[PDB]
Amino acid sequence: FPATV
Amino acid sequence: FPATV
Amino acid sequence: GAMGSMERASLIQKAKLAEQAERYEDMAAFMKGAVEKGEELSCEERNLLSVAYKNVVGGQRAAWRVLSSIEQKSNEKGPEVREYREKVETELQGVCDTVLGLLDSHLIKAGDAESRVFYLKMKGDYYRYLAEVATGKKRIIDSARSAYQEAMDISKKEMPPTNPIRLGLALNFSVFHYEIANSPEEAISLAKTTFDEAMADLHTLSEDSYKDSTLIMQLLRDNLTLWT
Amino acid sequence: GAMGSMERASLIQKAKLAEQAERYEDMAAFMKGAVEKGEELSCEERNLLSVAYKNVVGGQRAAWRVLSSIEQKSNEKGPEVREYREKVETELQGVCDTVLGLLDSHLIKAGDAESRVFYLKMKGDYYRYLAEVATGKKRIIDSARSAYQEAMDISKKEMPPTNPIRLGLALNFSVFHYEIANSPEEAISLAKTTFDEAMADLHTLSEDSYKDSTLIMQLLRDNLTLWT
Ligand SMILES: N/C(=C1\C(=O)C(=O)N(c2ccc(O)c(C(=O)O)c2)[C@@H]1c1ccc([N+](=O)[O-])cc1)c1ccccc1
Numbered sequence: 436f437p438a439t440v
Numbered sequence: 441f442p443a444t445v
Numbered sequence: 446g447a448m449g450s451m452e453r454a455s456l457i458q459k460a461k462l463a464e465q466a467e468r469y470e471d472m473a474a475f476m477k478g479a480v481e482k483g484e485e486l487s488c489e490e491r492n493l494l495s496v497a498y499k500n501v502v503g504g505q506r507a508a509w510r511v512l513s514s515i516e517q518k519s520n521e522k523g524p525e526v527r528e529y530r531e532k533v534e535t536e537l538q539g540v541c542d543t544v545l546g547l548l549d550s551h552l553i554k555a556g557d558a559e560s561r562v563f564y565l566k567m568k569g570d571y572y573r574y575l576a577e578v579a580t581g582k583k584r585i586i587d588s589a590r591s592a593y594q595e596a597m598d599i600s601k602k603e604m605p606p607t608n609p610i611r612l613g614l615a616l617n618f619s620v621f622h623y624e625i626a627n628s629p630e631e632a633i634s635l636a637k638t639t640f641d642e643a644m645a646d647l648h649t650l651s652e653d654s655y656k657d658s659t660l661i662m663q664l665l666r667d668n669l670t671l672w673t
Numbered sequence: 674g675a676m677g678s679m680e681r682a683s684l685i686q687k688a689k690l691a692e693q694a695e696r697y698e699d700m701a702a703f704m705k706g707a708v709e710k711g712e713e714l715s716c717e718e719r720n721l722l723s724v725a726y727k728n729v730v731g732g733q734r735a736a737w738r739v740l741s742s743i744e745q746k747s748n749e750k751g752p753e754v755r756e757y758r759e760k761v762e763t764e765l766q767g768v769c770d771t772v773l774g775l776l777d778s779h780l781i782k783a784g785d786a787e788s789r790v791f792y793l794k795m796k797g798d799y800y801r802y803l804a805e806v807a808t809g810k811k812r813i814i815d816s817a818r819s820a821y822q823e824a825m826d827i828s829k830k831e832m833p834p835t836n837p838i839r840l841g842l843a844l845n846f847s848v849f850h851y852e853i854a855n856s857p858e859e860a861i862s863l864a865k866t867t868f869d870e871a872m873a874d875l876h877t878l879s880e881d882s883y884k885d886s887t888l889i890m891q892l893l894r895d896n897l898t899l900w901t
């Protein structure tokens with residue numbers, strides 16, 4: 436999965 | 441702390 | 446509710462104690478109780494609220510993915526996998542609904558523009574999480590996009606391109622374009638633009654938050670590296 | 674209760690699914706429901722039960738220590754730290770009481786000798802956990818010691834000195850002597866004896882569990898190294 440914040 | 445299992 | 450007889454300031458204290466104890470469900474419950482006192486949140490309080498709930502749904506999403514993958518390979522039997530996946534899914538939706546209700550009922554107002562970017566990003570995030578498990582759904586996608594878009598428009602005007610909330614918003618919105626709305630080109634463009642414009646105006650970094658800007662800008666590259 | 678309408682075998686399946694999802698509270702709830710079907714547990718089922726609950730109380734103990742340390746440095750103010758510590762403490766005691774009730778109500782019987790060592794070790798462990806937070810208490814210490822001692826006597830006679838449950842029992846009992854009963858010399862002796870006698874009869878290792886014996890024997894040395 437890609438990065439989120 | 442010491443080890444437990 | 447269950448926090449109603451406690452002083453607001455004690456709720457904030459206990460939220461911080463729960464964070465130190467890594468008790469994020471308690472942390473979220475304390476912050477929810479504090480929001481229900483009716484007073485606007487400080488910048489610090491907003492971020493305690495977000496940390497708590499994002500940590501709770503994060504574990505639920507991780508759990509949900511583990512079961513969904515098993516369920517997917519089961520279909521290539523018994524109903525137990527679907528049932529348990531459905532149980533964790535129903536739980537996840539409950540927390541998302543709890544946060545979205547709190548955002549419209551209490552937090553989103555009137556308030557300053559930075560305030561509004563923070564809350565609107567949360568609105569889009571938790572709508573995105575519901576979209577990750579929904580079907581039948583695109584009503585949820587539209588409301589995620591609309592919350593994100595309004596947050597973008599405000600932030601382009603009111604915040605420097607290195608602000609961590611602005612950078613995090615674009616990062617998450619880009620991922621939304623990719624994994625949710627199935628628009629890789631729009632996801633890539635937004636992430637390249639967001640990163641490039643932050644470097645063009647690197648001088649706007651702030652002493653109090655430049656470490657958070659550095660990290661989110663590396664994450665924007667990590668996603669680009671991942672999508673090439 | 675809430676698991677009463679589900680097939681025993683589905684409960685076992687879902688316990689394994691929850692473990693894969695790292696949902697140990699669900700895992701414990703499924704196993705509890707399975708034990709309440711009235712049937713003796715297999716060796717595998719016993720260890721699923723133990724893994725679930727030991728993982729749940731482990732996080733509660735870790736949380737409780739974090740708050741107790743803060744509370745201790747607070748006393749050198751406000752009541753919020755004590756209150757939250759007390760809240761997590763009351764929760765911990767509830768789970769320990771839930772397991773100990775299940776052991777006497779259902780599991781401890783009649784059954785084989787290996788069975789009895791497993792359950793009696795759990796009895797001593799969860800009594801030890803209640804002693805870690807109790808005061809006023811030594812009633813809890815006595816019942817931890819008595820459960821441990823009976824488990825030792827049976828295991829000396831019925832299990833080789835390399836059996837992982839036997840080794841784990843002595844490890845935990847040794848720690849009990851040290852940190853609970855305040856008898857470092859007895860804790861050290863039991864751990865040295867336990868390790869030495871396992872090496873003397875290293876040939877009794879089993880193909881199916883020698884990796885678990887190797888690990889627990891290193892842990893016995895880690896504690897000795899720590900107590901010299
Ligand atoms: N836990 C973190 C934060 C804080 O604790 C916090 O108070 N920050 C913050 C920093 C600068 C601001 O100017 C604001 C605001 O003006 O509110 C707030 C961090 C923050 C960064 C990015 C987002 N985001 O994109 O959502 C939220 C929070 C965190 C740090 C890096 C990555 C992910 C999370």
Ligand SMILES: N/C(=C1\C(=O)C(=O)N(c2ccc(O)c(C(=O)O)c2)[C@@H]1c1ccc([N+](=O)[O-])cc1)c1ccccc1
Pocket residue numbers: 445716717720724787791794836837838839840841842882885888
């Ligand atoms: N999760 C673990 C186990 C299993 O999953 C499991 O089924 N094992 C096991 C192995 C051999 C036996 O012969 C028995 C029995 O006869 O029951 C059971 C492990 C086991 C080792 C030690 C204890 N202990 O000391 O309590 C319990 C379980 C674990 C491994 C190393 C350290 C701590 C936990």
